[PDB]
Amino acid sequence: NLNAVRETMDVLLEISRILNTGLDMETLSICVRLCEQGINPEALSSVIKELRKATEALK
């Protein structure tokens, strides 16, 4: 499966590059590897936007 999910991740990169998604290349690789285990993506949209606020609060 990892041969296929490595190519499905490279094709998922393009549609977020022309849509100009805030997510970078490495966090896409973490989140697809997390999503294939089985996690609600609707909860993932709430963690990332607040975790990125809290790292800037240190700076």
């Binding site: 285990q37 089985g38 996690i39 609600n40 909860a43 963690v47």
Partner: protein
């Protein structure tokens, strides 16, 4: 914390874990033993070495406190020796089993507030704190410790007490069936160390089954499930047929001889007796738990039985980490560290105006 620093103590059945809030690892872990003269009331290495004039007693047995003096002894010796801190500047989080009677809980808060004198405190169910580490606030937890075991439903900060299922099967029954199947094959047991080394053999080398039919069907045609153990004591035992049938006792309960229910019927009965509207919302993320993950492979079974249990209108979104053994600990550690969680904490003022018994009401 931020205002007055919290502390977290998880008194498990196989070990005591103590530490400070905001610490990923526990600051100290020692084995579960409480001394008595047959030196006196020690937790650690001396009590284990001196079991010829010390009485081996465990504080927590099934999820219930067998001897109250025993529990106070391990609690006192844990706070004064493997922490060494003044209680006046540190409130402590205490742990308990799910579906514990109200009189036990009232006595527990009363004994911690008076014979030990805390400023503020909390008494917590273990399985909900284990769920809080996996990020969700709802889910069904299948918790099988080393002596304590429940399948607890919890949904949005509240557990239905009618559907919390207390489960006989545990690490206690695990070592019981270990010694039973070994003497049934033919093996001498005479002391505590033979029990310890057989438990270690199930922990390290033993295959954790997935069916009884399938692995026995592959082993009856050609035994490729044999794993060699060549001991330095002078003993040569090696059998692959016994080691896949040994953790099979949860699949069908009559493998052990136990009257009590099996694991799939337990999680079925718990989700059936938990609410109908919360059912799919519960299944939107199911959570793993249990100290029985010391050989990994029970995790696949947990995902497998929860796939078969709940109706699949969705790919199963089950959270399966290798934080399963210490999930209780890290749950207590992450919740107690926060300042907003001090609003769920009980103070001395509340203990004085409404009695201790409000611990049954405020937390469950």
């Amino acid at each position: 914390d931020d205002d007055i620093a919290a502390l977290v103590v998880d008194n498990g059945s196989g070990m005591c874990k103590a530490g400070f809030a905001g610490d990923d690892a526990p600051r100290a872990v020692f084995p579960s033993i409480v001394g008595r003269p047959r030196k006196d009331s020690y937790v650690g290495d001396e009590a284990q070495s001196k079991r010829g004039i010390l009485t081996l007693k465990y504080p927590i047995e099934h999820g219930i406190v067998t001897n109250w003096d025993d529990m106070e002894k391990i609690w006192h010796h844990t706070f004064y020796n493997e922490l060494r801190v003044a209680p006046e500047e540190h409130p402590v989080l205490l742990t308990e089993a799910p579906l514990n009677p109200k009189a036990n809980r009232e006595k527990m808060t009363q004994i911690m507030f008076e014979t030990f004198n805390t400023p503020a405190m909390y008494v917590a169910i273990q399985a909900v704190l284990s769920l809080y580490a996996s990020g969700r606030t709802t889910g069904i937890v299948m918790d099988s410790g080393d002596g304590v075991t429940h399948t607890v439903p919890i949904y949005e900060g509240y557990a239905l007490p009618h559907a919390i299922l207390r489960l006989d099967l545990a690490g206690r029954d695990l070592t019981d069936y270990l010694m039973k199947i070994l003497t049934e094959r033919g093996y001498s047991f005479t002391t505590t160390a033979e029990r310890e080394i057989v438990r270690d053999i199930k922990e390290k080398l033993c295959y954790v089954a997935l069916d009884f039919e399938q692995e026995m069907a592959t082993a009856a045609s050609s035994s490729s499930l044999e794993k060699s153990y060549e001991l330095p004591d002078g003993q040569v035992i090696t059998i692959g047929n016994e080691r896949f049938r040994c953790p099979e006792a949860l699949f069908q309960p009559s493998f052990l001889g136990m009257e009590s229910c099996g694991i799939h019927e337990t999680t079925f009965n718990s989700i059936m007796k938990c609410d109908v509207d919360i059912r799919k919302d519960l299944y939107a993320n199911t959570v793993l738990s249990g100290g029985t993950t010391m050989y990994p492979g029970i995790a696949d079974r947990m995902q497998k039985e929860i796939t078969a249990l709940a109706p699949s209108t969705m790919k199963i979104k089950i959270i399966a980490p290798p934080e399963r053994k210490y999930s209780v600990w890290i749950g207590g550690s992450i919740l107690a560290s926060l300042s907003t969680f001090q609003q769920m904490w009980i103070s001395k003022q509340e203990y004085d105006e409404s009695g201790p018994s409000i611990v049954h009401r405020k937390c469950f």
